[PDB]
Design a protein around this ligand. Structure first.
Ligand SMILES: [Zn+2]
Ligand SMILES: [Zn+2]
Ligand SMILES: [Zn+2]
Ligand SMILES: [Zn+2]
Ligand SMILES: [Zn+2]
Ligand SMILES: [Zn+2]
Ligand SMILES: [Zn+2]
Ligand SMILES: [Zn+2]
Ligand SMILES: [Zn+2]
Ligand SMILES: [Zn+2]
Ligand SMILES: [Zn+2]
Ligand SMILES: [Zn+2]
Lengths: 274, 274, 274, 274
């Protein structure tokens, strides 16, 4: 066999955090990542676990997550460093039988704790489980540069921002037909931002935090990264276009309608009506 | 000997898709790549082939491709992932004796299929074989960032866009004297876009899809990548120039004429007449 | 055991200089880095030391640094090259018992000397030791591209520049609540710039040199790099925003106040009053 | 011992071409590089040489280069590929006893030839040998993106362009006090451009070719790359500044004078007088 560091999920967390770091999305400790696992994923490795797993209570219980293991990035940890020492910067946590707290089964060495945003990641996992009949398994936050820049110049409105993003690369309507939900600026790490993000996650796989960054959900690390990368690539194109004095032409409503029909998706009505 | 993963063509596909990924041209599954092989390339490795190669019919037969093997990127596959698992993300296909379909000789594991754009890649291969007396072997699509951005600000016209690209780096006229053919925006993955792209490929080695990306043809992976990289580098320069308020000076018609004479190329007349 | 090149501190210097090089912050010999060590760090490796450590006097003695070892980048050395040959490009120096000079214990082969800016790094180390009760251990200088660009377009004033940086990413107020001190342009490598930078370091962990670059202080290589990376990422966002015609909206004073309260920091009053 | 591929000079050529490729300066075959060697460099490896070195005549003899070996990039070769197969993409050439031609001692396999710009590189080597009493050993050409972009917006005049570059990063006056000589646009690969570049090399270590790229000279690969990287980094800053609507403040003549005095350099008078 092998050590847990060579598992598909530890190697996956490494690749995702490194690639996000390399894109320029995760300065310092900016960003966090949680992946919902099955018991079968971690089972072969139980003797690599901490002998006496630390328990941390959850302020709000999440019975929908009872008995569920996750691999998570740590609080104050750098995406840059994950590849260098996965055990120091990542943890495997398991929510207990009534969803009242979790045990830290592996990693987060030297008394590290999960991302301060864990109970918020958990709330969004809950809404995404319901919204997708258990398909979604990942919540990813990063400081995607061009998407951030756009929040200073575009109206911070779901329909308006979504429509520009759709225009900025042909694939975007196909990739996120439900659009990108945009919150008002909120104090990060608060219960209130967690709740508001989870509420937006009911209707969208992508949520923007003006002047701060993006939140994405998806079934796998690759698909979730890909989702955020698609929105950020469109944002990159838009920044160049706006910098050159704006669109002389663009993808029309008629074209977006034809696109949604061909790919069997229902584009967000408000964004499409503009 | 060696396994097929170490062949020049599998290693070539890996390098090309990775480099395109690293340039920022291939977010998510954006992009696709097909390379026409000879029987001699794949022959040493036949016992590595799937035991019972899956057959897929072609909607339109292509007898010009009868008996021809290709290595191709898979549908829904990420350029990012090719280096990690070539067999999962790439396939070797061989068109049958009457060009009615192809067998999947190798790769595309777990029921993966070639790029949904395979019959379109095939149509362009056909036109490029005819246009170059069999020299061209590669069709490459990617989401080249600056070229995309320019399609929102420049007139989407072959002559006009080609002329700006020629101006944006001295080598461009020498590298693509036949210019870049620009289609109207079209729904991707359709028969209609495949046909229109193949028609443009009769007269140009590079074709642009407004608000979406670029298509290039060439004799080798390196030369085809190089061709697209040249156009995208010129586009990068132009974006910076337009962002700084536009050209105060540029390469003149007189200079472009002198350049084409020295290098023994015939610049596209309409682009040169501007 | 191991050679000194595999120590945490030599490997740390390698990663920090390489990453800064990869970010585009350290063309040629642009940039310098010094890390304050303990005797326990270098002790195991004393027999790897130069047999007869070269002594260099300090123009101004620094008794606060008596007996203190540092690992430092060399004068005229390239950040790019550190990874290739740490011993050629890095040195371990130890300040003597009265702070009158230092011995070169290791590295800086072929008669290389520490960064010409060593006595200035030392002055800032002194002010940062006092300002943080010995917590700070690193002084890092680099040519952070977007921060440089901003010094041609923003008022070069501590309060004004700090406030824009806070606005340019939500985390910035939390990461540098004391702000970024901005000096007038000064001739580099002079006693005068060393003194002025050290004076600014009394009140700020980050100091800008208009038309030149940034200086940061912190307790570890990672945290200091992270600090500079945070300011530069905000600057990158601001450059894009200014390029697109400026802020239509931004983080308000009210929001910054709420942010500082939640995170338990006191934002620089003058920057906050704007 | 070792094979020639592990020599300092083959490894140096690899690093220089790869790094230039990674910076985005060398799309396709854009760019070329020649390094003047001594007989002592190549001597240990003579039995690795081609058995019967191919001879190529020089159109104009260069007796100043008699008996001199060089390692060079090949014609039509990609900087990207050098790391993959140095022998295919690089050659060691040795100019014969009267400077009438050269033998290809090593590399350029499969009938490859040195950069079509070899006799031009050679002419500049000659002028740089004279200008520096034999210190300069490298001629490097690349398609440095931001420097190219600036040639569409700044006056293509030595004094004017040099002065902006000096302003764009404090170190530039110190690094190239003699300035950057700017030619008119010329047809590349011609005798005329070779001559004009060599003439500019009498007075400058850096020469710009509008709408095309840069040429640099220096004593080592690192120092020459560093020289070009410095000018390109300043150009990058200037592009951002011009994109944000231009300089509100900048490095003054008075400051540049003070800078040149401190560093013991004589700034180009015409650029300084502006
Ligand atoms: Zn965040
Ligand atoms: Zn067990
Ligand atoms: Zn919504
Ligand atoms: Zn596409
Ligand atoms: Zn067999
Ligand atoms: Zn056409
Ligand atoms: Zn500096
Ligand atoms: Zn000892
Ligand atoms: Zn201050
Ligand atoms: Zn060139
Ligand atoms: Zn011999
Ligand atoms: Zn001159």
């Amino acid at each position: 066999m092998q050590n847990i560091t060579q598992s598909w999920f530890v190697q996956g967390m490494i690749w995702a955090t490194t690639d996000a770091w390399l894109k320029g999305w995760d300065e310092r400790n900016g960003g966090n990542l949680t992946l919902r696992l099955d018991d079968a994923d971690i089972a072969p490795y139980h003797d690599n676990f901490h002998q006496q797993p630390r328990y941390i209570p959850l302020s709000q219980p999440m019975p929908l997550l009872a008995n569920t293991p996750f691999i998570v990035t740590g609080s104050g940890k750098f995406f840059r460093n994950v590849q260098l020492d996965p055990a120091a910067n990542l943890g495997i946590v398991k929510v207990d039988s009534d969803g009242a707290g979790y045990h830290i089964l592996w990693g987060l060495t030297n008394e590290a704790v999960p991302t301060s945003e864990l109970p918020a990641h958990f709330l969004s996992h809950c809404e995404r489980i319901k919204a997708t009949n258990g398909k979604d398994r990942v919540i990813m936050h990063c400081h995607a540069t061009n998407l951030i820049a756009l929040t200073y110049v575009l109206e911070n409105d779901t329909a308006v921002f979504t429509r520009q993003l759709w225009e900025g690369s042909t694939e975007c309507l196909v990739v996120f037909p439900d659009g990108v939900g945009i919150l008002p600026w909120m104090v990060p790490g608060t219960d209130e931002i967690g709740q508001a993000t989870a509420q937006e996650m009911q209707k969208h796989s992508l949520v923007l935090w003006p002047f701060h960054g993006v939140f994405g959900s998806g079934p796998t690390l690759d698909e979730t990264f890909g989702l955020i990368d698609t929105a950020e690539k469109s944002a990159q194109v838009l920044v160049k276009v706006y910098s050159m004095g704006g669109m002389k032409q663009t993808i029309s409503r008629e074209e977006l309608i034809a696109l949604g029909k061909r790919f069997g998706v229902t584009p967000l009505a408000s964004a499409l009506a503009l």
